[PDB]
Amino acid sequence: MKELIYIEEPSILFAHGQKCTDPRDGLALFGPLNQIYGIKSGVVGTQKGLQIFKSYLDKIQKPIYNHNNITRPMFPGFEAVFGCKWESQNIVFKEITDEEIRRYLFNASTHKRTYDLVTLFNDKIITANKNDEERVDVWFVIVPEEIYKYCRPNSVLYNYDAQFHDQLKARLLEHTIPTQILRESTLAWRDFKNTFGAPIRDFSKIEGHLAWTISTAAYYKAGGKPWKLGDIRPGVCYLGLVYKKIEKSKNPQNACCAAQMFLDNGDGTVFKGEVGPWYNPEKGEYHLKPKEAKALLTQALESYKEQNKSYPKEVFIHARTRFNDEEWNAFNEVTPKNTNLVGVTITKSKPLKLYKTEGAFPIMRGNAYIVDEKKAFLWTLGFVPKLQSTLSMEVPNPIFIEINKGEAEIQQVLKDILALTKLNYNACIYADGEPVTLRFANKIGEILTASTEIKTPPLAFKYYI
Amino acid sequence: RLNAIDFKKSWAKGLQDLLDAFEKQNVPKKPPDHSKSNLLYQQIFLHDKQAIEKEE
RNA sequence: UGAGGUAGUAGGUUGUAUAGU
């Protein structure tokens, strides 16, 4: 009885000023907008890690294909898709001895085991970056199977997180060093054998997709922008607010809100929030004290001024929970009178499974549902005709947007969200369920709330994923 | 006099429309023996680039 | 990457140990 209005797929800008829907296929067609001249890879690990990383990179030099590449497109080779060169030569390596590994591993406490391993890795990165006459732009540490399976918190035979890469990145924030974490099981599925025999990380049919993801992550961390967005109106900032909960022992952790800002470029000019003991989790509705609200808004405004040399005529605010009215009263007292405030709440737990009456494929991605002029249902999950398969399993679930306060066209915020949800960098996929500013929200909150020693972190995005 | 092949707003659809021209069809240069799987995988197995319309 | 599993709070119910006139 009621229609499902569809929103067209926004095309991402590519090389030579052209646009295509799929990032993989079009990136194989055109390439990156601004080519880099190449980067040096610093692998930190063992000799086995050395040989397996060199073998994997030599494997991804030559073109490799997936099982069917309508869904997971081809990988023509790193030089054949990015332009910048990558070879096994001129690769810097740092020795990780078993003696330190064994001396650390023989301790029973797993948390201090994580502590000493991250301390060793950070110290070796520091002594590789502070005295070596050579230059490394990207680091690729390798964790073997035994370290990953023995550092689990609940494996049975306080100021830091139990997991590795979160606090590695958190302690590596201050020195402005980009790096990537690679599991041994990820790139060595050939010899990674379980009890049965099959690879646990069975990347055999999608080694092209694995090469796609790794190469895109490396080119992102290199410094060259892989892609940008197609259509952006002048004077809009997508401020996706984070409210990742922090559990630093028994001190008042409360709220540690953060944000990612999209003004005119794909990268998120992320500014750290406060440690922030206010708003006792009895009132754990994750609102904002006015002074931090104007602090964050002024931070975004001066970021827009320093990166665009003008004033933003419109503000987008994204979150998961609802918004109050006093925080917006504090917001509007500092905004210019020509601005516009929009607060959109994104939820997933709402149960709504539009089953298909007849056919062989479910509801596609992009078919939105309008309830009111302020709230709507958007399907960023499911079938897409370009990839010719769904991105979900069983039946996908949509996202429910809701403009809390502020007047706006629901179609405008729908198109803005659909344009935002196609910039996943660490994973090379056509689209995801949640938007990118919310997909990266958990990562940025985890990184910025893992080490309290960080005060003013680097506001470029390359040091996080 | 002659037909103008579109290449202005995009290049991939213009390229496939160029492929649609006669005596320049999807067959690669009348392939005698081999070297056909790669190109068919690249192009004719990747025919899908846009959407379609139907009521469901 | 989406569906199940535990701690417990959005916001109004009624049990503890005082004090308004």
Nearest CA in chain A to B37: A65
Give me the A residues in range 270-289 that sit within 7 A (CB) of strand C: 281-285
Burial of residue A233 (number of CB atoms within 10 Å: 0-12, 13-18, 19+): exposed
Tokens of A34: 């601004």
Angstrom distance, A136 CA to C13 C1':
63
Handedness of CA A114, A119, A120, A124 (dihedral sign): positive
**Alpha-carbon distance A201 to A393, whole Å?**
19
β-strand pairing of A41-45 with A138-143: parallel
CA distance from start to end of chain A: 45
A247 touches strand C (CB under 7 A): no
Token look-up 């379980």 returns A194
In the chain, the amino acid numbered A396 is P
Q: Are A26 and B12 inside 8 Å of each other by CB?
A: yes
**Alpha-carbon distance A179 to A162, whole Å?**
19
User: What are the E-state strand segments in A51-190?
Assistant: 92-95, 138-143, 179-183
**Alpha-carbon distance A247 to A160, whole Å?**
10
Partnered with residue A296 across adjacent β-strands are none
Give Cα separations from A186 to A138, A204, A455, A465 (angstroms).
18, 11, 34, 16
- Alpha carbons within 13 angstroms on the beta-carbon side of residue A182 total 30
SS3 for A465? coil
**Alpha-carbon distance A397 to A50, whole Å?**
42
Q: Are A272 and A256 a contacting pair, CB within 8 Å? A: no
**Alpha-carbon distance A33 to A209, whole Å?**
21
A384 touches strand C (CB under 7 A): no
Q: Are A24 and A11 a contacting pair, CB within 8 Å? A: no
SS3 for A412? helix
Token look-up 């021209």 returns B21
Residue B35 φ then ψ, to 5°:
60, 55
**Alpha-carbon distance A150 to A143, whole Å?**
11
Angstrom distance, A55 CA to C7 C1':
46
Angstrom distance, A433 CA to C1 C1':
9
Angle CA A20–A464–A22, to nearest 5: 10
What residues have CB less than 8 Å from A401, skipping those under 6 apart? A344, A345, A346, A375, A376, A377, A378, A413, A414, A417
Angle between helices A47-61 and A207-222 (to 10 degrees): 100
User: Using H for helix, E for strand and C for coil, what is the string for B1-56?
Assistant: CCCCCCCCCCCHHHHHHHHCCCCCCCCCCCCCCCCCHHHHHHHHCCCCCCCCCCCC
Helix count (H) and strand count (E) of chain A?
A: 13, 16
Tokens of A391: 């991105």
The nucleotide lying nearest A397 (C-alpha to C1') is: C2
Experimental method: cryo-EM
Tokens of A438: 């919310």
**Alpha-carbon distance A113 to A167, whole Å?**
13
Q: For residue A16, which residues of chain B lie inside 8 Å, CB to CB?
A: 11
Other beta carbons within 10 Å of B8: 7
Of A21, A30, A70, the CB nearest to B46: A70
Other beta carbons within 10 Å of A161: 20
